[PDB]
Nucleic acid binder design. Structure first.
Ligand SMILES: Nc1nc2c(ncn2[C@H]2C[C@H](O)[C@@H](COP(=O)(O)OP(=O)(O)OP(=O)(O)O)O2)c(=O)[nH]1
Ligand SMILES: [Ca+2]
Ligand SMILES: [Ca+2]
Ligand SMILES: [Ca+2]
Length: 341
DNA sequence: GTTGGATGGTAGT
DNA sequence: CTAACCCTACCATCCAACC
């Protein structure tokens, strides 16, 4: 079984360069403007020229403006990138209808049947990169392995505008040699628990007591890592299905005032309900980000679909429930829908 | 025991 | 207002209602 993974290069920023070809070769930074003050908010992403200077996805815009004053700062246009993204997903579809869209800019193809070996798979990767550059002038990075996880890694090892195979040989070695903190799914907190344990490599997990590992990182992660290690990982490529859709906004200033918070919450509901598109949710959750940025939420599942009217009425109740129970001012407010019929 | 709801932690993009 | 967006997946834990 062979799996090809495609992840587009500095996406949002690359789209901006294609739409505006003068930008290429200069620093470009795509920003989410929060509205709270001149340049309040965060960097969605930035091109490699910009990354050279410490400007990356996630930092605060005014810090980007600090460390790289003279770059090009562009406002995020999520719908433009999504149209490009849709056109590209359809290209990848030409190459295999067995596709798994994992986000705005990346996908896993199962190519077990288009190709007999890694060499052909490699050439298909080459055939892919070309088509996308032909049709959407977008460069991408391709990872090929026997499974999602190791394909992802191959891609990570090749960014930007690269293509890499990890063959059965490589897989065997990376199990023995690749730092554990580099396994997709193993973030900071986890990685820390694993070193206190003395597990630095995927292989280290084999020679430990399952119940001792579990009783540190959780069941799900423990099984997962051991599966990886035993080279028994075989999660198929499956058509992704949204489990929840929502929207959360940033207020002009922090409040506790229901009158002041309400138009933000309602804005979220409109956008959220519009993004649903013939989907009927049985569960609503109001989500609040506090002064000190701790995230907090109150929900309700009904036994039936929620109509836009129920959602309205319900989200106010729930926002009150937060305010009743947490006495910190609120900074961002939004809503989330789930359990679609 | 079962599942499944509320809330929150962790991870990733 | 003085930095920290935006969105979704999956999982753990704390309960409760129950086959
Ligand atoms: N608003 C916002 N958007 C983000 C954030 N992280 C990623 N994105 C968006 C912008 C990216 O172009 C798009 C794909 O992200 P990626 O993680 O794949 O990296 P990107 O393509 O930007 O650079 P690439 O070479 O992978 O590193 O997702 C974030 O923290 N906030
Ligand atoms: Ca990506
Ligand atoms: Ca990318
Ligand atoms: Ca990590």
């Amino acid at each position: 079984g062979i799996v090809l993974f495609v992840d587009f290069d500095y996406f949002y920023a690359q789209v901006e360069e294609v739409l505006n070809p003068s930008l290429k070769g200069k620093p470009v930074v795509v920003c989410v403007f929060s509205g709270r003050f001149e340049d309040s908010g965060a960097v969605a992403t930035a091109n490699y020229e910009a990354r050279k200077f410490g400007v990356k996805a996630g930092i605060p815009i005014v810090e980007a403006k600090k460390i790289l004053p003279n770059a090009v700062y562009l406002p995020m246009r999520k719908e433009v990138y999504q149209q490009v993204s849709s056109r590209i997903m359809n290209l990848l579809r030409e190459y295999s209808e067995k596709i798994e869209i994992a986000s705005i800019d990346e996908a896993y193809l199962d190519i077990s049947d288009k190709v007999r070996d890694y060499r052909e798979a490699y050439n298909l990767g080459l055939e892919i990169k070309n088509k996308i550059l032909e049709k959407e002038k977008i460069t991408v990075t391709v990872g090929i392995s026997k499974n999602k996880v190791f394909a992802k890694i191959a891609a990570d090892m090749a960014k930007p505008n690269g293509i890499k195979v990890i063959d059965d040989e490589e897989v065997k070695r990376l199990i023995r040699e690749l730092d554990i903190a580099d396994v997709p799914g193993i973030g900071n907190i986890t990685a820390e628990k694993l070193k206190k344990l003395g597990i630095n490599k995927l292989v280290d997990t084999l020679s430990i007591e399952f119940d001792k590992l579990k009783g540190m990182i959780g069941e799900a992660k423990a099984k997962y890592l051991i599966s990886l290690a035993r080279d028994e990982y075989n999660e198929p490529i499956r058509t992704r299905v949204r489990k929840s859709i929502g929207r959360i906004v940033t207020m002009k200033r922090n409040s506790r005032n229901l009158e002041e918070i309400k138009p933000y919450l309602f804005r979220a509901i409109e956008e959220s309900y519009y993004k649903l598109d013939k989907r009927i949710p049985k569960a609503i959750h109001v989500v609040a980000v506090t002064e000190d940025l701790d995230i907090v939420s109150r929900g309700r599942t009904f036994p039936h679909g929620i109509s836009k009217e129920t959602a309205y009425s319900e989200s106010v109740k729930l926002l009150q429930k937060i305010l009743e129970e947490d006495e910190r001012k609120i900074r961002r407010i939004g809503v989330r829908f789930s359990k679609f019929i």
